[PDB]
């Protein structure tokens, strides 16, 4: 009968997510760190981690 | 190119890698290997080199 | 204990949106109207804008 409008209480955005939780994706590959003897730093690829 | 949703699926060698910049990555998930990706990609910066048939006697 | 079930009021649809407002896109190029000479209207590019 009487419209009693106070606005609504919304100070926080409400977000929805990906069914899995993590967004996009990009392949990546593990590396290690053979010392950089006398020089900077090497950077090889370890074999323990699937690439 | 590498837009959102887009890359939330799988690449297509006509869809993306031709009419688009086809940087790489999306050029590499179509095969997922090393056999064809290199050779294929080499022909879109400046063209294919075996078009000219440079080498002699097979 | 006793169910007064009569559905719900949903004449309107609800809709989320892209965190930043617009989701896809499509680069574009400014084309100032360097109009034609005499007859057919030609075009050109502008350097005032971005690319
Ligand atoms: Ca990917
Ligand atoms: Ca990758
Ligand atoms: Ca892909
Ligand atoms: Ca085509
Ligand atoms: Ca695509
Ligand atoms: Ca596209
Ligand atoms: Ca792709």
From TrEMBL, chains A, C:
It is found in: Host nucleus; Virion. It comes from the Viruses. Ca(2+) binds at residue 27. Coiled coil: none annotated. Induction: Expressed in the late phase of the viral replicative cycle. Signal peptide: none annotated. Homotrimer. Interacts with the capsid vertex protein; this interaction binds the peripentonal hexons to the neighboring penton base. Interacts with the hexon-linking protein; this interaction tethers the hexons surrounding the penton to those situated in the central plate of the facet. Interacts with the hexon-interlacing protein; this interaction lashes the hexons together. Interacts with host dyneins DYNC1LI1 and DYNC1I2; this interaction might be involved in intracellular microtubule-dependent transport of incoming viral capsid. All late proteins expressed from the major late promoter are produced by alternative splicing and alternative polyadenylation of the same gene giving rise to non-overlapping ORFs. A leader sequence is present in the N-terminus of all these mRNAs and is recognized by the viral shutoff protein to provide expression although conventional translation via ribosome scanning from the cap has been shut off in the host cell. Belongs to the adenoviridae hexon protein family. Major capsid protein that self-associates to form 240 hexon trimers, each in the shape of a hexagon, building most of the pseudo T=25 capsid. Assembled into trimeric units with the help of the chaperone shutoff protein. Transported by pre-protein VI to the nucleus where it associates with other structural proteins to form an empty capsid. Might be involved, through its interaction with host dyneins, in the intracellular microtubule-dependent transport of incoming viral capsid to the nucleus. This is Hexon protein. The lineage of its organism: Viruses, Varidnaviria, Bamfordvirae, Preplasmiviricota, Polisuviricotina. The chain holds residues 405 to 455 of 959 of the full protein.
Automatic annotation (TrEMBL), chain B:
It is found in: Secreted. Residues 1-46 form the Gla domain. This is Coagulation factor X.
């Amino acid at each position: 009968r009487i419209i009693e409008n106070h606005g609504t209480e919304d100070e926080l955005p409400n977000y929805c997510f990906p069914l899995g939780g993590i967004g996009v994706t990009d392949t990546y590959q593990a590396i290690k760190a053979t010392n950089g003897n006398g020089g900077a730093t090497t950077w090889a690829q370890d074999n323990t981690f699937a690439e | 190119a590498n837009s959102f949703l887009e890359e939330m699926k799988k690449g297509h060698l006509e869809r993306e890698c031709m009419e688009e910049t086809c940087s790489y990555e999306e050029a590499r998930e179509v095969f997922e290997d090393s056999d064809k990706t290199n050779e294929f990609w080499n022909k879109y910066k400046d063209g294919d080199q075996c078009e000219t048939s440079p080498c002699q006697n097979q």
